Amino acid sequence: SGISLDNSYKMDYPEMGLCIIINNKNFHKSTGMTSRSGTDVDAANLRETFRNLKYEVRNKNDLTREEIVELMRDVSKEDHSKRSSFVCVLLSHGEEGIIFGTNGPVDLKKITNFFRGDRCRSLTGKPKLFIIQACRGTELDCGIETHKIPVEADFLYAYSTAPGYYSWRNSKDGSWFIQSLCAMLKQYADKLEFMHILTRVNRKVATEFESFSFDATFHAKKQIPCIQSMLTKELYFYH
C-alpha cells in the first residue's frame, strides 16, 4: 500500500457503540432534592441525536445510586469488541466529582473506573465519552459585557459547566448545555472533529444563554461548559 496516517480513532467497527442515558428527574423525598423539570426534553433530544449518529441508545430513568453503579458495572462487562466507542450521558443533580442517584450521591470516579483501560478490555484504545449535565458546585457566573497505555487514556469528559459552578437548566427548553450539544451535533457531526464541535457548543452556551430570575442572586448569570479531554486521537463520527 501507500503512505498511511493514524491520527484518528477507528470508527468503522460494525457498531458505533452504546449510548447510555441516565435521566434522573424525581428524587426520594428524604434526600430533599427537587424535581428536575425540563430534563425529559433533554433525554429525548439526546436519544434522537445519538440515534442519528448510529449509536444503540439505552434510556434509563430515575435510578437509585445502587442502580447507577450496577448498570455501569454490567455495561462495562459487555463485550464491546465490535463497537467503535462508548458514550454515557448523566442528567442529574450533582456537585464537584459527584452525580446523584434518586436516593443519594455517586462518585463520578466510581462510574468511570469501570471503563478504565485495564478493567474494560474490549474498550481499550477506544474513545469513552462521558457527558455530564449536573452542578459542580454553587458558584454563579456574573459575566462581563463585551507497549502499554495509561488506564486513564481515551476518556473525554464533556461537562456542562466550569469546575465549582452551578449548571443551568430551563424547565421548558431543557438544559442550556444539552440543548446546545444536540444542535451542534446535528449540524456538524458529519463535518467537524468532536473537539471542534464541543468548542462550538462552548460558544453557544457562553453567548446565547443568560439566566432570568425574580431572585437577584440568580438573575443575569452566565455559563461556560468545560471540555476535559484525555483522548489520544481525533474523533470523527463519520468514516
Partner: peptide, 4 residues
Amino acid sequence: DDDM
C-alpha cells in the same frame, strides 16, 4: 434494556 430501555425505559424510553
